Design a protein around this ligand. Structure first.
Ligand SMILES: C=C1C[C@](OC)([C@H](O)C(=O)N[C@@H]2OCO[C@H]3[C@@H]2O[C@H](C[C@H](O)CO)C(C)(C)[C@@H]3OC)O[C@H](C)[C@@H]1C
Ligand SMILES: [Cl-]
Ligand SMILES: [Cl-]
Ligand SMILES: [Cl-]
Ligand SMILES: [Cl-]
Ligand SMILES: [Cl-]
Ligand SMILES: [Cl-]
Ligand SMILES: [Cl-]
Ligand SMILES: [K+]
Ligand SMILES: [Mg+2]
Ligand SMILES: [Mg+2]
Ligand SMILES: [Mg+2]
Ligand SMILES: [Mg+2]
Ligand SMILES: [Mg+2]
Ligand SMILES: [Mg+2]
Ligand SMILES: [Mg+2]
Ligand SMILES: [Mg+2]
Ligand SMILES: [Mg+2]
Ligand SMILES: [Mg+2]
Ligand SMILES: [Mg+2]
Ligand SMILES: [Mg+2]
Ligand SMILES: [Mg+2]
Ligand SMILES: [Mg+2]
Ligand SMILES: [Mg+2]
Ligand SMILES: [Mg+2]
Ligand SMILES: [Mg+2]
Ligand SMILES: [Mg+2]
Ligand SMILES: [Mg+2]
Ligand SMILES: [Mg+2]
Ligand SMILES: [Mg+2]
Ligand SMILES: [Mg+2]
Ligand SMILES: [Mg+2]
Ligand SMILES: [Mg+2]
Ligand code: NA
Ligand code: NA
Ligand code: NA
Ligand code: NA
Ligand code: NA
Ligand code: NA
Ligand code: NA
Ligand code: NA
Ligand code: NA
Ligand code: NA
Ligand code: NA
Ligand code: NA
Ligand code: NA
Ligand code: NA
Ligand code: NA
Ligand code: NA
Ligand code: NA
Ligand code: NA
Ligand code: NA
Ligand code: NA
Ligand code: NA
Ligand code: NA
Ligand SMILES: [Sr+2]
Ligand SMILES: [Sr+2]
Ligand SMILES: [Sr+2]
Ligand SMILES: [Sr+2]
Ligand SMILES: [Sr+2]
Ligand SMILES: [Sr+2]
Ligand SMILES: [Sr+2]
Ligand SMILES: [Sr+2]
Ligand SMILES: [Sr+2]
Ligand SMILES: [Sr+2]
Ligand SMILES: [Sr+2]
Ligand SMILES: [Sr+2]
Ligand SMILES: [Sr+2]
Ligand SMILES: [Sr+2]
Ligand SMILES: [Sr+2]
Ligand SMILES: [Sr+2]
Ligand SMILES: [Sr+2]
Ligand SMILES: [Sr+2]
Ligand SMILES: [Sr+2]
Ligand SMILES: [Sr+2]
Ligand SMILES: [Sr+2]
Ligand SMILES: [Sr+2]
Ligand SMILES: [Sr+2]
Ligand SMILES: [Sr+2]
Ligand SMILES: [Sr+2]
Lengths: 160, 186, 92, 95, 154
RNA sequence: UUAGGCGGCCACAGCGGUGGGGUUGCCUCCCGUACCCAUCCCGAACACGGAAGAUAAGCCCACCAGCGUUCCAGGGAGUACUGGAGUGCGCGAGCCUCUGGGAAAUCCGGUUCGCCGCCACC
RNA sequence: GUUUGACUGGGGCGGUACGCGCUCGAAAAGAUAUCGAGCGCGCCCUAUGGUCAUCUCAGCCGGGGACCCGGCGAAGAGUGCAAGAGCAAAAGAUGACUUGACAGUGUUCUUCCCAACGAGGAACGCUGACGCGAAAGCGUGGUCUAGCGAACCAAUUAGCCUGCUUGAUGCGGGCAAUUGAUGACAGAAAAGCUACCCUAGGGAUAACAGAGUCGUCACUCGCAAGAGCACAUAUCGACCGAGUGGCUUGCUACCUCGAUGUCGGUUCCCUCCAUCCUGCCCGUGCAGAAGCGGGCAAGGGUGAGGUUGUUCGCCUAUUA
RNA sequence: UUGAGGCGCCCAAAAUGAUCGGGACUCAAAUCCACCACCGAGACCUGUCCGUACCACUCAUACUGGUAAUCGAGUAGAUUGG
RNA sequence: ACAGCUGGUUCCAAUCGAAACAUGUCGAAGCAUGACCUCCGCCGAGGUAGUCUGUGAGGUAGAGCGACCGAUUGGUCCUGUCAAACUCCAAACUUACAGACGCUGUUUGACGCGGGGAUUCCGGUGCGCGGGGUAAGCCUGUGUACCAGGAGGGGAACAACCCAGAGAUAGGUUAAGGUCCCCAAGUGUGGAUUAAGUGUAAUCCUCUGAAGGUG
């Protein structure tokens, strides 16, 4: 289905699994990536990806982006390069669809999304001053698969 | 103690000195409480009224100042208890107090116990307290017959300092007697 | 809930306390000499009757316990309300 | 609502804050008021008997005599005047 | 002492606000009242902040206005020094004007109508769709600004 | 209050800890079961009677902030949110200005190791 | 001769949101809708009720998943049943006593916010009688909020009133109250077909068409994993993301029910471009020939036939 | 070399005849920041009159005088004079 | 014939002026009882639409959760996220009562009380907050102002957007909005940007334009 159906925030927060059922499983396979044993302070550079508009990101978008995003870093830095990217958000908001007529319209659970207020960090990478351009390119790809426009901001990087 | 959600009992309950659940029932009558409390060596009998910042004591009576009138004997027995009661009963009679409800505190409603024996004295003093006759001890044990007949089982004085060997429950009568006297400085 | 065959209770009579039994109304028959045995033939004839041409109605998923509290020394009884009980046992 | 019972939607108003749990002090379940006195109606979650209909929490009434040990406070619901029977345990002297 | 001036109509304005205005003895657009400065009086103007123009006028202007727009409690009688003196515990406009500002008396306490029915601002005002800060005419004003208007509404 | 009884507020009073305190005084632990009373078994408790001993508990007194809690300073923050107004902006979700209010988390620094009432008493 | 209800994103089918209780929706007083989300009640118990005495629970640790001793332990236990709430020297557990789940009559609130309305319900009094306790006191059922029902008729109960001139006997009329149910739950005893139809009306309400919407459908774009023997980008192209159209479908119920004739076809006229051919172009996995993909472009053209009412589609032979 | 902001450009396909109402406008007749002068209601101010309500006078609800910043829109409907 | 259903019901003016909602109803195209409109009589001094302050009620926004609760990462304590049916926190704000100021009432009698007569119980829109639905000129709440039942001015036309609430007549100044022409008023002033006719379109079914990109 189109993201148009669930990109804005207009329903009440809907996440009480204790009342909701048939909630589809997350398509996300890893929130921690790269060398997840090292640390964030172990790196000079810390570039995160910031969402410019508050929205909802269906897990299919997170994974779709996170994938092609990280997949780049794996390519340009090796399946064991010296980096560690992270996706801090999680798909809590449950999404329904009324699939009859308008009678008894409450839908049936079909997905999960992550509410991300504008200005927040969807992703946060940690790399060495060299691969800083491979991470920026790794985000240029990722922000093409989520709905909002974004900013690639450096949290620690005087090397420029 | 643990965190915010924690619940610490009302002070007087931690201390384990006031039985609020029972207290309430008491406080209801509207009548002053005839507080009866024991002690290893002593026995007190306060007459409390309720107040804006805490209970008020309109009339007490401690077994210690029981000697103040001529008591040369111990201060933690039936004779003692009764008397102390009748003493406070009188003082209270001197404050405008006419009726009260026995507040035996954390003690036990045991038959013939010093408390009921304390309650019996305040009644005799003229006060009006809801009681149960057959729960009070027999006039004699109130006097000290139970103890006198114990020293009969002598061989060794019932007491240390000499009040007397055979003990004088008559003294009980002597003191009680002295209380019904109008003069007596309360 | 059961029901003690003989419990100590009050009664709107002797202003005192004795023993009251427990007996489920055994009711009575149709007199035949009542105001309904006559107007049953007077409110009929040929056709319909309305209340006489009607039939009995159903019941609730339970039946309240209709009683009669007989007395010991006395010998008479009164009437209180009943409770919706599937059954009941006047223990002994 | 979904049901029209007295306690409908009264989770909030009829419940003590954690540290106010358990039995309540007797000092206020015995408080004596004088006819005419203004009092604030507020139910004590810890207290069971002597409660007025929840819908009246927050009302400031005027003691116009008492029934038994309980009081008969006068209040005005919207525009209709009503006589509420409440026990001291659920009352506070105004001002 | 502040000069309250209704600059926005009644249609569509909340009722509790309009009721406040009428409480402040102001019933029509362009009508003006001189309100003290207490907590109570503050709450009211604050609440009317959007359909009014207010501030403290210069003794000068306050006079210019009183002269041109003050009225008895009933009548056409011009409120001029003579009038003022013959009825008010004062001796002339300036005398009155000073008290109002010093907050000693009130147009009513004297026998003047609480309202000063002004005339449309000559040359127009700075608009009723924005405050004074945004370049409009609504809200609190500069003792000079307030005058600029009241002056213009002789 | 050189140690007590009854309380109100019911953690600022909790939790944890250190140090001091008692010859006929107080409170206790304590000594003991003939009686009133007592234990589904126990004088443990409850109840009764009494001082040979003790200040080790308790309790009272002084103090400690590590945990919990109350309030306060500064920082967060006039930020989040928000009552009123706008021919202000934005495709839009939404944002902004003016006016009146205004947090929470957290951090650092103070406070807090109870307060007050009546009665009795070297 | 009549009956055969109502609700309803039209009606039918389905369902019950048709009487009740709880949390959320509900926007920090009160009130608050939808075929709103989660879920219940139509009883059950004579002890599983009442009081008094004694006592403290889950779970955990250590000493000998039964038992026993000690320690930590404000409550996570238990309290009949939904949910929310109350409760620890108790409202929970044990023991014993007890049967107040008693008679009767009221006040108040609720039922029905505000604001009139019955039954039912609750809190709170008084009179009588009881139960427990030393006593204050507690018991008008189970800690609170669900477990409920009018008249008529029948039965039943205490005392009293009364039945046509009159006495006796018999049988009746009545005051007061209990039980038996109407769940469509403020109560009718009660099935269907009608294309043979009929009337009153409705665009208060469906079907064609219009209009809004665009999930669906058609088309595009972004990023470009992947393959294409090597090579993303000759060509193909997933995922995800952004959109355009108003041809499909669905949705809504705004317009029309004192009627806007309903599919397909035909005939005749105008148009759109997202282009099938034709003109001019670019790339090629462009030798040529023949293609494949793309750009500009709507001047012109885009035909005849076999099955099927078919639209669509399948099939034949011609065709630039 | 890199950060930021402004206006604009690409993305951008529909059916009888194109559109900001039209004309047409480019150091503007656009946009943004300021400023000056004007035009423009039945609103506001003002002269006179009318109705209505209230006051004085009055038998009057007939005159006369007075007050209204705080009276003057209205479907269903209630009320009343003609 | 009956109908709760469609149509129609004839002169002037003055005062006030709705309800399209609650409870029950074989009730939903109808009634009844309330709310609300109006008229009459009675009572006789207070009343409370605004604000401020004092004494109270509250768990929505926000926030947070080694504070409960249930969700929800990873690493050898540290680290990553949530909640309509969670809460150690917590507004704005709404709300009871009282005082004060304001306003109002005691010849215009308020507040209140009794009685007669209604209409009404298809609502709609804007805005704020909502719940459902991809959406809707959707369905269904709530507070509020407006349309209905509201002229006049402006917005090209246009119930509800802006100004404005309006006796007659008249002079004047303004409001919204506008000043190149059509068209009353500037081809106004200082300065900058734009080269696309971007634009000359407050709001909107109505005025689109997006992700992405732009020596
Ligand atoms: C409880 C209910 C009972 C009743 O009251 C409301 C009514 O009582 C009834 O209908 N039947 C009864 O049967 C038992 O007692 C009587 C009653 O009347 C019978 C005649 C009937 O009233 C007309 O035909 C009867 C034959 C006189 C019979 O005699 C024994 O109505 C509903 C049925 C309602 C559900
Ligand atoms: Cl004691
Ligand atoms: Cl039976
Ligand atoms: Cl009540
Ligand atoms: Cl051919
Ligand atoms: Cl006339
Ligand atoms: Cl008006
Ligand atoms: Cl042009
Ligand atoms: K038609
Ligand atoms: Mg019948
Ligand atoms: Mg709530
Ligand atoms: Mg005047
Ligand atoms: Mg002008
Ligand atoms: Mg203007
Ligand atoms: Mg020591
Ligand atoms: Mg806009
Ligand atoms: Mg129907
Ligand atoms: Mg009902
Ligand atoms: Mg509420
Ligand atoms: Mg029967
Ligand atoms: Mg019904
Ligand atoms: Mg017909
Ligand atoms: Mg329609
Ligand atoms: Mg035709
Ligand atoms: Mg083309
Ligand atoms: Mg052509
Ligand atoms: Mg053919
Ligand atoms: Mg007329
Ligand atoms: Mg007239
Ligand atoms: Mg929240
Ligand atoms: Mg109409
Ligand atoms: Mg001109
Ligand atoms: Mg254009
Ligand atoms: Na269906
Ligand atoms: Na006959
Ligand atoms: Na409490
Ligand atoms: Na046994
Ligand atoms: Na010691
Ligand atoms: Na039927
Ligand atoms: Na009733
Ligand atoms: Na579209
Ligand atoms: Na369509
Ligand atoms: Na055709
Ligand atoms: Na062509
Ligand atoms: Na064919
Ligand atoms: Na009319
Ligand atoms: Na008919
Ligand atoms: Na109806
Ligand atoms: Na009807
Ligand atoms: Na006043
Ligand atoms: Na919010
Ligand atoms: Na309606
Ligand atoms: Na209006
Ligand atoms: Na117009
Ligand atoms: Na143009
Ligand atoms: Sr929504
Ligand atoms: Sr994007
Ligand atoms: Sr007959
Ligand atoms: Sr027959
Ligand atoms: Sr049934
Ligand atoms: Sr011993
Ligand atoms: Sr728009
Ligand atoms: Sr869009
Ligand atoms: Sr401030
Ligand atoms: Sr038929
Ligand atoms: Sr249908
Ligand atoms: Sr109860
Ligand atoms: Sr059949
Ligand atoms: Sr046929
Ligand atoms: Sr070609
Ligand atoms: Sr077709
Ligand atoms: Sr086919
Ligand atoms: Sr084209
Ligand atoms: Sr008029
Ligand atoms: Sr009129
Ligand atoms: Sr009017
Ligand atoms: Sr509210
Ligand atoms: Sr010019
Ligand atoms: Sr210029
Ligand atoms: Sr863009």
């Amino acid at each position: 289905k189109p993201a148009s159906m669930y990109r804005d925030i207009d329903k009440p927060a809907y996440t009480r699994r204790e009342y909701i059922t048939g909630i589809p499983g997350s398509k996300i396979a890893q929130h921690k990536m790269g060398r997840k044993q090292k640390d964030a302070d172990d790196y000079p550079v810390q570039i995160s990806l910031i969402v410019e508009e508050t929205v909802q990101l269906r897990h299919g978008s997170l994974e779709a982006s996170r994938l092609s995003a990280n997949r780049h870093l794996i390519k340009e830095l090796g399946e064991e390069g010296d980096y560690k990217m992270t996706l801090r958000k999680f798909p809590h908001q449950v999404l329904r669809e009324n699939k009859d007529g308008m009678r008894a319209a409450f839908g049936k659970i079909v997905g999960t999304a992550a509410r991300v207020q504008a200005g927040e960090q969807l992703f946060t990478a940690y790399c060495n001053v060299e691969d800083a351009e491979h991470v920026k390119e790794a985000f240029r790809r990722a922000y093409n698969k989520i709905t909002p426009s974004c900013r690639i901001k450096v949290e620690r990087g005087e090397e420029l | 103690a643990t965190g915010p959600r924690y619940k610490v009992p009302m002070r007087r309950r931690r201390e384990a000195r006031t039985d609020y659940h029972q207290r309430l029932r008491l406080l209801k009558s509207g009548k002053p409480r005839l507080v009866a409390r024991k002690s290893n060596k002593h026995v007190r009998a306060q007459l409390v009224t309720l107040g804006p910042n805490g209970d008020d004591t309109l009339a007490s009576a401690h077994s210690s100042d029981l000697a103040e009138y001529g008591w040369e004997a111990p201060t933690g027995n039936m004779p003692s208890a009764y008397l102390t009661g009748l003493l406070a009963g009188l003082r209270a009679q001197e404050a405008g107090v006419e009726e009260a409800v026995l507040d035996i505190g954390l003690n036990s409603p045991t038959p013939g116990s010093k408390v009921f024996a304390i309650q019996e004295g305040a009644i005799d003093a003229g006060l009006d307290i809801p009681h149960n006759d057959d729960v009070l001890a027999d006039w004699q044990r109130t006097r000290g017959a139970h103890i006198a007949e114990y020293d009969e089982q002598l061989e060794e004085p019932l007491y240390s300092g000499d009040f007397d060997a055979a003990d004088l429950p008559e003294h009980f009568d002597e003191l009680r007697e002295t209380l019904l006297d109008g003069d007596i400085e309360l | 809930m059961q029901m003690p065959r003989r419990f100590n209770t009050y009664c709107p009579h002797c202003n005192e306390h004795q023993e009251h039994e427990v007996e489920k109304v055994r009711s009575g028959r149709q007199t035949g000499m009542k105001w309904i045995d006559r107007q049953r033939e007077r409110n009929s004839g040929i056709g319909n009757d309305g209340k006489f041409s009607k039939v009995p109605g159903g019941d609730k998923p339970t039946k309240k316990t209709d009683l009669k509290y007989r007395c010991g020394e006395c010998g008479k009884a009164h009437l209180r309300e009943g409770w919706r009980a599937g059954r009941l046992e006047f223990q002994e | 609502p979904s049901s029209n019972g007295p306690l409908e939607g009264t989770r909030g108003k009829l419940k003590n804050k954690p540290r106010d749990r358990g039995t309540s002090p007797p000092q206020r379940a015995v408080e004596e008021f004088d006819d005419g006195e203004k009092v604030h109606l507020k139910i004590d979650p810890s207290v069971p008997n002597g409660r007025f209909h929840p819908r009246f929490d927050g009302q400031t009434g005027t003691v116009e005599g008492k029934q038994g040990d309980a009081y008969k406070v006068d209040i005005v619901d919207g525009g209709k005047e009503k006589t509420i029977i409440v026990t001291a345990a659920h009352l506070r002297r105004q001002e | 002492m502040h000069a309250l001036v209704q600059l926005r109509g009644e249609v569509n304005m909340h009722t509790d606000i309009q009721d406040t205005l009428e409480m402040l003895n102001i019933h029509h657009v362009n009508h003006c009242t001189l309100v003290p400065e207490t907590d109570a009086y503050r709450g009211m103007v604050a609440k009317v902040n959007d359909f009014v123009a207010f501030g403290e006028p210069s003794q000068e202007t306050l006079e210019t206005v009183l002269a041109t727009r003050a009225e008895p409690l009933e009548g056409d009688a011009d409120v001029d020094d003579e009038w003022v003196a013959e009825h008010t515990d004062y001796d002339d406009i300036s005398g009155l004007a000073f008290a109002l500002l010093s907050e000693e008396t009130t147009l009513r306490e004297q026998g003047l109508s609480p309202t000063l029915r002004l005339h449309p601002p000559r040359g127009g005002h700075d608009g009723v769709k924005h405050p004074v800060k945004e370049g409009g005419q609504l809200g609190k004003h500069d003792t000079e600004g307030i005058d600029d208007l009241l002056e213009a509404m002789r």
